[PDB]
Design a protein around this nucleic acid. Structure first.
Lengths: 427, 41, 69, 214
RNA sequence: AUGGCCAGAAAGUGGUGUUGACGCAAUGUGAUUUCGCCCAGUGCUCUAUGUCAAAGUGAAGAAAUUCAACCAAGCGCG
RNA sequence: AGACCCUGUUGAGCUUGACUCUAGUUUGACAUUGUGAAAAGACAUAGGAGGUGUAGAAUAGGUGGGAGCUUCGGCGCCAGUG
RNA sequence: GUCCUAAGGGGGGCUCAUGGAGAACAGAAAUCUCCAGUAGAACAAAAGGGUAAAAGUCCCCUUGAUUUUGAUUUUUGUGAAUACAAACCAUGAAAGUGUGGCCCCUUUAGUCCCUCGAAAUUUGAGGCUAGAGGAAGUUACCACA
């Protein structure tokens, strides 16, 4: 505190220089720098010591992952978080974990546990830091996925159908939304979500600002959607917030959409959809309010389609005749979604071509709660067996899963035959 | 999007407070005190 | 001096080929600086061999606009 | 991997499990799978189910969480069942729901009660990975129990190793081969690269030395 | 001084140099009196991961060849 | 036939992270290049050993079988804690 | 990054927007009944053109939203549209109607595709065919026509 700013910066730089000269140990430098970082009033000194600590971790783990040093520093951060929940000094632990995670120096589940304790804290800034750790890493995850992807008339209608089949295949094999490594690496996701919901969202005594409550809600809803958890009071908690008068109601509707998933009962989601329909999509409602409500309803219907009633869905699909472009496109999106998912609720005018042909021929089956695929044979195995029989017939002119070994070339041929059959069914 | 109308219609945004009217007059102001840093001669 | 080439300078800066590159942009001059310093260079028309103006100078349009309300 | 090799591997497996050293219980043949060239978190965890032609597991106990009509069908078929009144008597206790999930390996519910299961048993069955399979009032309860017993799950998670039961010692060699090849082929179908991701395959009984296909 | 700054196509070549820091060389300012701070940017300069040429090494193939590590100075970091 | 303005497939001098080059310089390899010792590093293998955030009898990488193993003392399943 | 860039064919039945007068709650607005109603509705152009036993709406079957070859218009090849010609169909009692929606580099494949020019094979390359994707200033030192 008492020394000159330039002199104390030179002292810290000289200590880091001695560490590079290997006069002093990394543990000794970190334990003589970190309490000064925590308790120093000087902002410039705090920033410089934080930068030197990050550089020390990068230099130490440049050669190989120094597990002892990483474990000791994670222990220090965990003890700093555990010592005082009301103290604001946990933001330094949060910031250090963010910087090392984005530098990919730390990838183990112990920083995830440390930020779990950071989320389960009394201090608003520490809660915000931990929630941002679990949330805002999705942008870096999308960047890493982009890097991994970079590393990796009738004829026109048939080409468009093939493009649609390729999009369906991408949906069948393309990474799940809201996917993040720390969110997977944390243990007991149901318990963590319940603890966050009871501590911050349920408690009216919590004086958190609305944006911070929205951040905690985003964390809880991404956990519920990603790990398919069941937190029933959350859906009753959204009830008072699903109003157009409520600020950031777009964020609330997005959170409810992310919370919804397949194993959520239709009984608990239906009052939410009915409330959104009544408050947002009504004759006195504005066009923007109706469009936002229909978009939120479409998101919830993508996540769980069984929430609807048939009459309500037909009523909402009839909003495509609206003179507003946003309401029109939202209603058409809802109609198209139910065209692929559950065309039986849709009217015979609104089903379209492929839906009516599928319902007439009998291939399309009703979607049910809890129903899972139970395919006794592989997909396209019949087509692969037919191709093998055709090859045998050609050889003569010139059951497969039980006995025959699945060659990789045979699997590729079966996939090509399945794609051709899908294109023929689309045509 | 390159069209330039004489009057731009404000757009209602859901989940946000309503904008003040176009004819609204704001009388709030902030003042800063000028001080001369020179000692008595 | 491969490192002093403009292509290598843009790659080390982070700009991708395909971005708009104003003529005259180098290490000392950004697009803002070029646009600022070309204002002093404005003011000349484009003429033919006989001296009649084929494209006028800046803010000397010769064209009468349609003024309605 | 050659089918004759599969046949001879399961041949000495049965030979050891029945002749050389026979345990006091019925051992279960299971397949262990390693993965490679794959990210458990960046890429999708594949999930799938396949019905084996023969029941690999004669000793499974299946609980039925349904209405009175399904309870009557269960007691007619000699299958134990539990009622929604008993689920209410459990009073959403995590220890009791965990004990039920440990006791019963599989659960089968009606449509009328399968939407009430997550509000009666909470997150217990989802946590244990034992969410009930729907059964109608028109479907055969015994038949449904049969494919629930014959069906195995192929779900990926945080690690690159998997283990799936494919049969037992007492049920015989040719349908053992059929079940093993069906499981392997369904695995190759679920894999995005097929045999390019198969690290290692190994069959063994419950208490026996391993036998490596790969 | 096995040096600095320069010449020369090269040289067993030359200038400073018949020289040695009170010297040589490059600069800026320009008698005498009088007359702070900032290394932000750009320069110049001192010190294990990244970037990382040729040669060399390993694997595959029947070879052409392909893929891998290793990888000086400089750049980056400080 | 000057000076001034305008035009050019204009010429030339000069400047700069404009383009393409280049003297010089610096660094690495090979040759010049001989006679000797000592060390490490990287792969290849022959192996061997380990896991505390809290709670829990223990100091739980994880996964899938499993109620029986047993060297006949017990370890187990059960319960407890996760 | 999500969402929208539009369901066509045949046959049959019925009229729309709106106004007036009436019926417990029921009122400005819930459903029901009559009369008037040349389109003032709807048809994916917000005030263009065209449609009333329909081109609108509902119901029943269906995918002519299918292959193949020329001709014409917008004007070498396209693409779109227009009458057809052949096959296979759909609908309706039938006449008929329906061939959509009222108007230059990179890279992949080729069994029986061809060359590598002394002969053959295997890699590789080339060709042909058919696809997919996408170079700054200054001159008040000046000079020339």
């Amino acid at each position: 505190t008492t020394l000159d700013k330039d002199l104390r910066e030179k002292v810290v730089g000289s200590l880091v220089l001695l560490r590079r000269k290997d006069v002093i140990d990394s543990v000794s430098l970190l334990t003589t720098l970190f309490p000064i970082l925590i308790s120093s009033p000087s902002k410039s000194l705090r920033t410089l010591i934080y930068t030197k600590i990050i550089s020390d971790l990068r230099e130490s783990n440049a050669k190989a992952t120094n597990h002892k040093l990483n474990r000791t520093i994670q222990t220090v951060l965990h003890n700093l978080l555990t010592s005082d929940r009301t103290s604001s000094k946990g933001l330094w632990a949060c910031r250090i974990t963010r910087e090392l995670w984005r530098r990919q120096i730390w990838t183990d589940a112990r920083p995830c546990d440390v930020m779990k304790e950071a989320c389960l804290s009394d201090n608003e800034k520490v809660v915000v830091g931990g929630c941002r750790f679990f949330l805002g890493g999705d942008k870096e995850r999308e960047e890493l996925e982009d890097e991994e992807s970079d590393e990796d008339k009738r004829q026109k209608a048939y080409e468009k159908a093939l493009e649609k089949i390729k999009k369906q295949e991408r949906k069948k094999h393309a990474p799940h939304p809201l996917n993040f490594s720390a969110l997977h690496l944390i243990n007991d996701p149901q318990g963590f979500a319940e603890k966050l919901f009871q501590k911050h969202l349920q408690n009216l005594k919590n004086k958190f600002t609305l944006e911070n409550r929205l951040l905690v809600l985003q964390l809880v809803t991404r956990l519920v959607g990603l790990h398919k958890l069941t937190v029933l009071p959350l859906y009753s908690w959204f009830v008072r917030y699903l109003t157009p008068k409520q600020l950031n109601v777009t964020t609330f509707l997005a959170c409810l959409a992310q919370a919804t998933h397949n194993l959520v009962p239709p009984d608990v989601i239906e009052p939410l959809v009915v409330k959104i329909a009544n408050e947002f999509v009504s004759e006195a409602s504005a066009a923007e309010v109706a469009a936002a409500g229909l978009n939120a309803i479409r998101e919830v219907a993508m996540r769980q389609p069984l929430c609807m009633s048939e009459t309500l869905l037909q009523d909402l699909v009839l909003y495509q005749k609206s003179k507003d472009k946003g309401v029109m496109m939202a209603a058409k999106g809802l109609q198209s979604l139910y065209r692929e998912v559950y065309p039986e609720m849709l009217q015979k005018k609104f089903r379209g071509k492929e839906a009516t042909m599928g319902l007439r021929a009998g291939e399309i089956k009703p979607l049910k709660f809890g129903e899972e695929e139970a395919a006794e044979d592989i997909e396209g195995i019949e087509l692969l067996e037919k191709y093998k029989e055709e090859q045998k017939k050609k050889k003569v002119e010139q059951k497969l899963a039980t006995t025959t070994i699945l060659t990789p070339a045979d699997l590729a041929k079966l996939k090509e035959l399945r794609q051709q059959a899908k294109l023929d069914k689309m045509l | 999007k390159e069209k330039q109308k004489d009057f731009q219609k404000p757009k209602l945004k859901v989940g946000k407070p309503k904008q003040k009217p176009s004819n609204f007059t704001d009388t709030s102001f902030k003042t800063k005190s000028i001080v001369v840093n020179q000692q008595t001669l | 001096g491969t490192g002093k080439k403009e292509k290598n300078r843009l790659l080390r800066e982070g700009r991708t080929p395909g971005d708009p590159h104003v003529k005259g942009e180098n290490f000392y001059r950004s697009a803002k600086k070029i646009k600022t310093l070309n204002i002093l260079k404005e003011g000349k028309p484009i003429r033919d061999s006989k001296g009649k103006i084929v494209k006028a100078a800046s803010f000397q349009s010769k064209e009468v606009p349609k003024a309605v309300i | 991997i050659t089918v004759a090799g599969v046949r001879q591997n399961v041949a000495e497996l049965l030979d050891y499990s029945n002749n050389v050293k026979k345990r006091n219980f019925l051992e279960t043949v299971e397949l262990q799978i390693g993965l490679k060239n794959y990210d458990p978190q960046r890429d999708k965890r594949f999930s799938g189910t396949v019905k084996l032609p023969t029941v690999p597991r004669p000793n499974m106990s299946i609980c039925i969480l349904g209405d009175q009509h399904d309870i009557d069908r269960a007691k007619h078929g000699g299958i134990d069942a539990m009622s929604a009144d008993d689920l209410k008597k459990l009073n959403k206790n995590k220890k009791l729901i965990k004990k039920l999930a440990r006791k019963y390996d599989a659960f089968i519910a009606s449509e009328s009660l399968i939407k009430q299961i997550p509000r009666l048993l909470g997150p217990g069955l989802s946590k244990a990975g034992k969410f009930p399979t729907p059964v109608s009032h028109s479907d055969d309860l015994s038949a449904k129990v049969n494919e629930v017993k014959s069906t195995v799950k192929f779900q990926l998670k945080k690690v690159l190793c998997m283990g799936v039961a494919v049969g037992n010692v007492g049920m015989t060699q040719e349908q053992l081969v059929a079940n093993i090849m069906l499981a392997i082929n369904y695995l190759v179908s679920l894999l995005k690269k097929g045999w390019q991701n198969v690290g290692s395959l190994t069959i063994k009984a419950t208490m026996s030395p391993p036998k490596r296909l790969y």
